[PDB]
Write an enzyme that holds these catalytic residues in place. Structure first.
Site, PDB file in Angstrom:
ATOM      1  N   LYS A   1       1.569  -1.286  -0.008  1.00 13.79           N
ATOM      2  CA  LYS A   1       0.316  -0.060   0.105  1.00 13.79           C
ATOM      3  C   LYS A   1       0.954   1.645   0.022  1.00 13.79           C
ATOM      4  O   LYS A   1       0.187   2.165  -0.665  1.00 13.79           O
ATOM      5  CB  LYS A   1      -0.626  -0.024   1.431  1.00 13.79           C
ATOM      6  CG  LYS A   1      -1.904   1.156   1.295  1.00 13.79           C
ATOM      7  CD  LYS A   1      -3.113   1.294   2.792  1.00 13.79           C
ATOM      8  CE  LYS A   1      -3.885   1.677   2.242  1.00 13.79           C
ATOM      9  NZ  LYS A   1      -4.634   2.137   3.591  1.00 13.79           N
TER      10      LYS A   1
ATOM     11  N   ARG B   1       1.752   1.421  -3.595  1.00 11.05           N
ATOM     12  CA  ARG B   1       0.956   2.544  -4.353  1.00 11.05           C
ATOM     13  C   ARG B   1       1.009   3.447  -4.321  1.00 11.05           C
ATOM     14  O   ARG B   1       0.792   4.344  -4.753  1.00 11.05           O
ATOM     15  CB  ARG B   1      -0.410   1.425  -4.646  1.00 11.05           C
ATOM     16  CG  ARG B   1      -1.248   1.786  -5.255  1.00 11.05           C
ATOM     17  CD  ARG B   1      -2.558   1.038  -4.838  1.00 11.05           C
ATOM     18  NE  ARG B   1      -3.198   1.307  -3.662  1.00 11.05           N
ATOM     19  CZ  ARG B   1      -3.823   1.792  -2.976  1.00 11.05           C
ATOM     20  NH1 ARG B   1      -4.614   3.124  -4.146  1.00 11.05           N
ATOM     21  NH2 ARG B   1      -4.589   1.486  -1.782  1.00 11.05           N
TER      22      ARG B   1
ATOM     23  N   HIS C   1       2.597   5.673  -2.598  1.00 17.69           N
ATOM     24  CA  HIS C   1       3.510   6.836  -2.557  1.00 17.69           C
ATOM     25  C   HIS C   1       4.967   6.866  -3.656  1.00 17.69           C
ATOM     26  O   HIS C   1       5.981   7.327  -3.245  1.00 17.69           O
ATOM     27  CB  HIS C   1       4.767   7.182  -1.174  1.00 17.69           C
ATOM     28  CG  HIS C   1       3.281   7.315   0.061  1.00 17.69           C
ATOM     29  ND1 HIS C   1       3.056   8.196  -0.268  1.00 17.69           N
ATOM     30  CD2 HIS C   1       2.702   6.237   0.819  1.00 17.69           C
ATOM     31  CE1 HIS C   1       1.520   8.556   1.028  1.00 17.69           C
ATOM     32  NE2 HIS C   1       1.183   7.219   1.926  1.00 17.69           N
TER      33      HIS C   1
ATOM     34  N   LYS D   1      -8.760  11.012  -1.804  1.00 21.88           N
ATOM     35  CA  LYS D   1      -8.149  10.640  -0.938  1.00 21.88           C
ATOM     36  C   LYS D   1      -7.652  12.584  -0.647  1.00 21.88           C
ATOM     37  O   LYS D   1      -7.115  13.622  -1.809  1.00 21.88           O
ATOM     38  CB  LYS D   1      -6.655  10.424  -0.942  1.00 21.88           C
ATOM     39  CG  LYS D   1      -5.380  10.168  -0.111  1.00 21.88           C
ATOM     40  CD  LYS D   1      -4.734   9.193   0.296  1.00 21.88           C
ATOM     41  CE  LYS D   1      -3.987   9.175   1.352  1.00 21.88           C
ATOM     42  NZ  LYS D   1      -2.497   8.379   1.106  1.00 21.88           N
ATOM     43  N   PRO D   2      -7.723  13.261   0.849  1.00 22.47           N
ATOM     44  CA  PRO D   2      -7.510  14.873   0.430  1.00 22.47           C
ATOM     45  C   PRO D   2      -5.749  15.080  -0.014  1.00 22.47           C
ATOM     46  O   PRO D   2      -5.897  16.118  -0.275  1.00 22.47           O
ATOM     47  CB  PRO D   2      -8.009  15.346   2.299  1.00 22.47           C
ATOM     48  CG  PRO D   2      -8.474  13.596   2.582  1.00 22.47           C
ATOM     49  CD  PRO D   2      -7.883  13.026   1.983  1.00 22.47           C
ATOM     50  N   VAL D   3      -5.244  14.761   0.919  1.00 19.34           N
ATOM     51  CA  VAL D   3      -3.546  14.598   0.765  1.00 19.34           C
ATOM     52  C   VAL D   3      -2.848  13.212   0.207  1.00 19.34           C
ATOM     53  O   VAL D   3      -3.062  12.249   1.178  1.00 19.34           O
ATOM     54  CB  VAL D   3      -2.861  15.324   1.998  1.00 19.34           C
ATOM     55  CG1 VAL D   3      -1.662  16.332   1.681  1.00 19.34           C
ATOM     56  CG2 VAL D   3      -3.712  16.793   2.243  1.00 19.34           C
ATOM     57  N   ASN D   4      -1.831  13.472  -0.178  1.00 22.15           N
ATOM     58  CA  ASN D   4      -0.776  12.090  -0.825  1.00 22.15           C
ATOM     59  C   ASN D   4       0.279  12.572  -1.818  1.00 22.15           C
ATOM     60  O   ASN D   4       0.417  13.764  -2.142  1.00 22.15           O
ATOM     61  CB  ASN D   4      -1.796  11.309  -1.715  1.00 22.15           C
ATOM     62  CG  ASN D   4      -0.634  10.579  -1.727  1.00 22.15           C
ATOM     63  OD1 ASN D   4      -0.712   9.545  -1.266  1.00 22.15           O
ATOM     64  ND2 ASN D   4       0.462  10.169  -2.647  1.00 22.15           N
ATOM     65  N   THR D   5       1.997  12.368  -0.739  1.00 23.78           N
ATOM     66  CA  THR D   5       2.836  12.265  -1.463  1.00 23.78           C
ATOM     67  C   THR D   5       3.440  11.373  -2.432  1.00 23.78           C
ATOM     68  O   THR D   5       3.303  10.728  -1.796  1.00 23.78           O
ATOM     69  CB  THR D   5       4.096  12.454   0.057  1.00 23.78           C
ATOM     70  OG1 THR D   5       3.014  13.637   0.776  1.00 23.78           O
ATOM     71  CG2 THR D   5       4.644  13.136  -0.221  1.00 23.78           C
TER      72      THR D   5
ATOM     73  N   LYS E   1       4.239  11.551  13.777  1.00 22.26           N
ATOM     74  CA  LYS E   1       3.551  12.970  13.993  1.00 22.26           C
ATOM     75  C   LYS E   1       2.589  12.088  15.517  1.00 22.26           C
ATOM     76  O   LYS E   1       2.278  13.017  16.585  1.00 22.26           O
ATOM     77  CB  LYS E   1       2.431  13.091  13.352  1.00 22.26           C
ATOM     78  CG  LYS E   1       2.891  14.328  12.072  1.00 22.26           C
ATOM     79  CD  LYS E   1       1.932  15.167  11.044  1.00 22.26           C
ATOM     80  CE  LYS E   1       2.974  16.304  10.272  1.00 22.26           C
ATOM     81  NZ  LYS E   1       2.408  16.416   9.224  1.00 22.26           N
TER      82      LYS E   1
ATOM     83  N   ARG F   1      -2.570  17.715  -3.028  1.00 19.82           N
ATOM     84  CA  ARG F   1      -3.704  18.077  -2.307  1.00 19.82           C
ATOM     85  C   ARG F   1      -4.764  18.855  -2.525  1.00 19.82           C
ATOM     86  O   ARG F   1      -4.832  19.078  -4.269  1.00 19.82           O
ATOM     87  CB  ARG F   1      -3.153  19.250  -1.219  1.00 19.82           C
ATOM     88  CG  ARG F   1      -2.735  18.698   0.203  1.00 19.82           C
ATOM     89  CD  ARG F   1      -2.271  19.938   1.001  1.00 19.82           C
ATOM     90  NE  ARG F   1      -1.117  18.829   2.165  1.00 19.82           N
ATOM     91  CZ  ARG F   1      -1.347  19.306   3.462  1.00 19.82           C
ATOM     92  NH1 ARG F   1      -3.208  19.445   3.476  1.00 19.82           N
ATOM     93  NH2 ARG F   1      -0.905  19.001   3.576  1.00 19.82           N
TER      94      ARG F   1
ATOM     95  N   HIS G   1       4.294   3.951   6.029  1.00 16.88           N
ATOM     96  CA  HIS G   1       3.190   5.098   5.886  1.00 16.88           C
ATOM     97  C   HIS G   1       4.242   6.277   6.577  1.00 16.88           C
ATOM     98  O   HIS G   1       5.219   6.158   5.945  1.00 16.88           O
ATOM     99  CB  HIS G   1       2.882   5.158   7.441  1.00 16.88           C
ATOM    100  CG  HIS G   1       2.369   6.513   7.987  1.00 16.88           C
ATOM    101  ND1 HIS G   1       1.371   7.301   7.420  1.00 16.88           N
ATOM    102  CD2 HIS G   1       2.832   7.534   8.899  1.00 16.88           C
ATOM    103  CE1 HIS G   1       0.925   8.257   8.036  1.00 16.88           C
ATOM    104  NE2 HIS G   1       2.270   8.037   9.154  1.00 16.88           N
ATOM    105  N   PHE G   2       3.830   7.448   5.516  1.00 13.58           N
ATOM    106  CA  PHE G   2       4.504   8.155   4.908  1.00 13.58           C
ATOM    107  C   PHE G   2       3.581   9.064   6.019  1.00 13.58           C
ATOM    108  O   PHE G   2       2.847   9.557   5.945  1.00 13.58           O
ATOM    109  CB  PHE G   2       3.679   9.243   3.722  1.00 13.58           C
ATOM    110  CG  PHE G   2       5.023  10.178   3.214  1.00 13.58           C
ATOM    111  CD1 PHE G   2       4.335  11.109   3.073  1.00 13.58           C
ATOM    112  CD2 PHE G   2       6.083   9.538   2.281  1.00 13.58           C
ATOM    113  CE1 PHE G   2       4.981  12.511   2.874  1.00 13.58           C
ATOM    114  CE2 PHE G   2       7.160  10.846   2.248  1.00 13.58           C
ATOM    115  CZ  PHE G   2       6.063  12.361   1.798  1.00 13.58           C
ATOM    116  N   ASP G   3       4.825  10.029   6.678  1.00 10.90           N
ATOM    117  CA  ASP G   3       4.244  10.466   8.174  1.00 10.90           C
ATOM    118  C   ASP G   3       4.479  12.340   7.656  1.00 10.90           C
ATOM    119  O   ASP G   3       3.777  12.957   8.100  1.00 10.90           O
ATOM    120  CB  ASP G   3       4.704  10.502   9.061  1.00 10.90           C
ATOM    121  CG  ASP G   3       4.195  10.906  10.310  1.00 10.90           C
ATOM    122  OD1 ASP G   3       3.332  10.480  10.688  1.00 10.90           O
ATOM    123  OD2 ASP G   3       5.335  10.869  11.238  1.00 10.90           O
TER     124      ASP G   3
END
EC number: 4.6.1.18
Lengths: 124, 124
Positions: B7, B10, B12, B41-45, B66, B85, B119-121
């Site tokens: 995941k 996919r 990041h 998805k509101p925000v993704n890098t 965080k 975003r 996870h991307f923090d």
């Protein structure tokens, strides 16, 4: 209790310096801003621009917040910031922080009248 | 269901380009990575480095996440990234994204054997 706006100022505003002054900046700032009192706040960003310039972000680029809220705003320009994060052998009450200086766009959530920042969402 | 590592890949990883190719990059990528299917998805890098280089971050600077978790890692070097975003008149199912290219440190949470990002923090 603090107002949401005042809490944002306490946690995130440092207009007194153009950038972090040393590798000890975060250790000093996290303590003096009362972010190590009840616990070590794990992550916290300070913004080295005028309060006016940061407040002005609430009238800039409307973008989604990480949590899906629609009241976030991204600064049109980059700003001098310092990221503070717990590192190494940080353990309450002996908090320890890594200081990372950068120049990036900030994203803040805004509320109220006047419409001002109440949460620091991220930097880009 | 996906593994947590898959995941992360996919959502990041984009090693196929050195940086966002156009202002439409996020619109294209959020769709093709299946991040607009159930909702916007509101925000993704996205990270524009090799998979090897991103996985390697799990052996770099241990920092707090965080949310207070202790399994986050900050890249020693900056990496080419793209922040996506939701903006303007984004409304599911007509999602719309702002593309912001930058060069920053990444912070990821790592788990498992092999110990890889899940996870991307944040970016700094």
């Amino acid at each position: 209790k603090e107002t949401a706006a005042a809490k944002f100022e306490r946690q995130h505003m440092d207009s007194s310096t153009s950038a972090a002054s040393s590798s000890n900046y975060c250790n000093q700032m996290m303590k003096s801003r009362n972010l190590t009192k009840d616990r070590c706040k794990p992550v916290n960003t300070f913004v080295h621009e005028s309060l006016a310039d940061v407040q002005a972000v609430c009238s800039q680029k409307n973008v989604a917040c990480k949590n899906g809220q629609t009241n976030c705003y991204q600064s049109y320009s980059t700003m001098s910031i310092t990221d503070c994060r717990e590192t190494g052998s940080s353990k309450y009450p002996n908090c320890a922080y890594k200081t990372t200086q950068a120049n990036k766009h900030i994203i803040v959530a805004c509320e109220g009248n006047p419409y001002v920042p109440v949460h620091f969402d991220a930097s880009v």
